[PDB]
C-alpha cells in the first residue's frame, strides 16, 4: 500500500488535489473517515470566487457552473432600515462571484476522481500520521475493523478543522492563532424563491441574517444565534420572524416563506496555524485554517491552497524543482492572513456582540456606512470578496 | 454681562468661534478658567488637515503657516524592520496636511481676538450653565473671588473634555459612547533635528512610537506607555532607548537625540456624546468628543464643528434663517462618527494591547500590510488623514 501522495480527507480540498495530481501523472490515494454518501451531501458553502470558478473550469470540472450556478454582481446590505446595493462587479473592475454550492463541487470532483481511477478509501478513519521526516511517511487508518497503512512520499492534510493531520504537526513547531466569536449561525434551506436578485445581508441590531439562494426556487438563509445553540429552540415561526425582522426593509420585496429543511447550527471562529507544512506533511484547507463564513472564503481558500500545493508537487516530481514545496506555507500564509483579516472585519461589523462596549457597537454602523458609502470602502470590499490573487 | 454668544473656553475652538463671529459683527464673550499663557502653551496638537489650514487662511489668521509650518505629504510606517512610506498627497488626489502646532494656532487666534476687541475673561471658571430653554441662557462664573453672570442668546460649550458644558446638557437627552484604551502616550519635545523628512510611525511589537517634527532642529516624539504612567519612571536614557527600538530600521537614518523638555503623559480614549446641542447650548470640540491622537484629528474636528456652528450662527443673525442651527448636531455627528472610526482603526492597529488574543494581535500586521501595500488601503488612509469634508 504505497503511493506518491497520501491524501487524508475526501472533502473538496482532498478531491481537487487528487484530481490535479492525477492529470499530471502523480499517484495519490485518498483516505476518508466518512461514508462517501455522507461526504457528498454535506451542505455548507454556497459561493465561489472567480478564481475558484476559473480553477474548476481549467481542471475540467466546471462544465455545470453556467447552468447550475448563479452569477453574482452585488451584495444588498440592509441596515438603518434601508437597502445598500454594493455592486462589487463594477467596483472590482469586472470580477464576479458565483452561487455554486459545495455539494455540486464535491459531486463534480468525485466524478472526476472516479473517471481517473483515483483510489479513495471511505469509512476509513486515519488514526495516526507517522514518519514525517522518515524516508517515506506512514498513514495509519482503520477500515472494516482492520488496521491499514499507506506509505507515501508526501501527506496532504485535507481532513478539515476536526481532522487528525493538524495535530500531526510537531507541537514544538506549530503555533495556533485562534479567536471564537460569541455567536453561531442557524442555517436553513427553504423552498421559497429569493425575494430579490442579490444575496442580501441583514446587518440588524437584533442580529445578523442572510438571504442567499441556490436557485430561482430555493433560498439558503442564516440567522445569528447563541454559540452552541440548540436548533430545537427555533420553531419555523421563530425562524421566519427573526429573518423578516433582520432583513425586510420598506421598498424592497418581503422575504418569501416556504417549508424549511436542513436546519443546523455552525460555529463562528477565526483560526490559523503556522506553519502549514513540516517535513513530508502539507496542510491545506480547513485543516490549516478556518474563517467565519460571512465572506464566503473557506472553500475558496482551500482551493487556493490546493492550487499552490498541486503546482508545487508537480514541480518536484516533473521538473526537478523542490523549492516550491519548500515555500508552500510561506506563500499560502501571506494570502491566508489577508483572507483572515477580511473575514474578521465582516464578522465583527455585521453581528451583534452581547454586552459589547457601546462605542465599539456604534462603530459597526460607521463601518457599514463607510464600506457601502465610499469609493475606497466599496473597492476594498469588492477586491476582497471576489477573491484575492493566488501566488 | 449681556452678549449675543457666550463662549465657555478660550482654547482653539472657543477663540476661533469668537473671531469668526467678530468678523460678522456678532458679539461674543469668551470665559476661560485658566490663565492666558497657560492656555496658549498647552502641548498637544501638531498636525492640521488641509481644510483646517484653508479655514485659518480664510479667517485671516493663516499668514504664519507658510513661514513656520511644514507641509506634509507622507507618513513613514515602520514595522517588520522596514520603512513603508505612504504618500498620502498622491493617494488623496493632491490633498495635504501641515505641521503647524496648536500653540501657534492659539497664539494666532488670541492675537486676532485681541485685535478685534473680543472680551476674554481669564482665570474665570464657569461653574454652571443655566436657562438653556429660557428666553436667554445664563453663564455663571467666578473671577477674582467674585461671582459673575453672562446672559446670552446662545452658549457655545468650547471647554474641552473636562469642562462643564457637556454636563450642562440635560442627562435625559444626552447619550455617551466611551471606550478607554489600555495604554497612554508619553510625549516629549527634543532639541534634535528629524532623522528623516517624513513624520514616522513606529508600529513595533514593543509598542507604538512616533517621530514627528516642529522645525529642522526640533522633534516631537511619542511612546506608548502604561495608562496613567508616571513620567518620573522615564529617564531620558529610557526614553531614547525605546524610541530607537521602536522607530529605527536598517537603511534609514537613526533617530537623533537632544535635550528633552515638556515630558508628559496623555490618555488614549474614544468618546462621543449625542446630541451636540440642546436649546441654546451648542457643544463643539473636545467638550463634545475626543479621539486617541494617532491620526491628528481632535483639533481638526474642533475646527470642523466651529466652521458649522459659526456659519449657523451667522445664518441666524445675518441671513435671518435658523434652520442651520437646528441641523448643527446632525451634521457634526455624521462627520465625527467617521472621524471616530478612523481614529479608532489607527489606534487598535499601531499599539500593543497587553494580553490581547493572539489572532487579533496578528491581524495588526495584516492591517498594516493592507493599509500600506494596496491602493484601496492607501486611498482610505489618505482621504481620512488629510481630512474629511465638512457639511
Ligand atoms: C455555514 C457555512 C457556510 C460556508 N459558506 C462558504 C461559502 O459560501 N464559500 C466558501 O468558500 N466557503 C464557505 N464555507 C467554508 C467551506 O465549507 C469550508 O472551508 C470547506 O468545507 C473546506 O474544505 P476542506 O476539504 O478543506 O475540508 P472539509 O470539507 O471539512 O473536508 C475534510 C474531510 O476530511 C475528512 N476527515 C476528517 N477527519 C478525518 C480522518 N481522521 N481521516 C480521514 N478523513 C478525515 C472529513 O470527513 C471530511 O470529508 C462555509 C462553511 C460553513 C460552515
Ligand atoms: C498629545 C496630543 C496630540 C494631539 N495631536 C493632535 C494633532 O496632531 N492634530 C489634531 O487635530 N488634534 C490633535 N490633538 C487633539 C487636540 O489637541 C484637541 O482636540 C484640541 O485641544 C481641542 O480643542 P478645544 O478648543 O475643543 O478644547 P481645549 O483645547 O481643551 O480647550 C478648552 C478650554 O476650556 C477651558 N475650560 C475648561 N473648563 C472650563 C470651565 N469650567 N470654564 C471655563 N473654561 C474652561 C480649558 O482651560 C481650555 O483652555 C492632540 C491631543 C493630544 C493630547
Ligand atoms: Ca409569528
Ligand atoms: Ca427667565
Numbering used by the authors:
A (entry chain B), B (entry chain A): 1 to 391
Task: Copy text from the publication.
To understand the substrate recognition mechanism of XaPobA, we determined the PCA-bound structure (XaPobA + PCA) at a resolution of 1.65 Å by growing crystals under imidazole-free conditions and soaking them with PCA. The β-sheets 14 to 16 in the substrate binding domain were located significantly closer to the catalytic center in XaPobA + PCA compared with XaPobA + imidazole, indicating that bound PCA induced XaPobA to adopt a closed conformation. The PCA molecule in the active site was adjacent to the isoalloxazine ring of FAD with the aromatic C5 atom to be hydroxylated facing the ring. The carboxy group of PCA in the XaPobA + PCA structure hydrogen-bonded with the side chain hydroxy groups of Ser212 and Tyr222. The side chain of Arg214 had two alternative conformations, one of which formed a salt bridge with the carboxy group of PCA. In addition to PCA in the active site, we also identified the electron density of an apparently catalytically inert second PCA molecule located near the ribityl moiety of FAD at ∼6 Å from the isoalloxazine ring. The Corey-Pauling-Koltun (CPK) model of the XaPobA + PCA structure showed that the side chains of eight amino acid residues formed a hydrophobic cavity with the aromatic ring of PCA. This was buried with the 3-hydroxy group of PCA enclosed by the Met72, Ile75, Val199, and Trp201 residues and faced the bottom of the cavity. The carbonyl group in the main chain of Thr294 formed a hydrogen bond with the 4-hydroxyl group of PCA and was the only hydrophilic interaction in the cavity. The side chains of Val47 and Ala296 formed a cavity wall parallel to the aromatic ring of PCA, and it was sandwiched between another cavity wall formed by Met210 at the opposite plane of the aromatic ring.
Para-hydroxybenzoate hydroxylase (PHBH) is a group A flavoprotein monooxygenase that hydroxylates p-hydroxybenzoate to protocatechuate (PCA). Among proteins in this clade, Xylophilus ampelinus PobA (XaPobA) preferred PCA as a substrate and is the first known natural PCA 5-hydroxylase (PCAH). The overall structure of XaPobA comprised a homodimer, with each unit binding an oxidized form of FAD in its active site. The XaPobA monomer consisted of FAD-(amino acids 1–73, 88–198, and 267–391)- and substrate (amino acids 74–87 and 199–266)- binding domains.
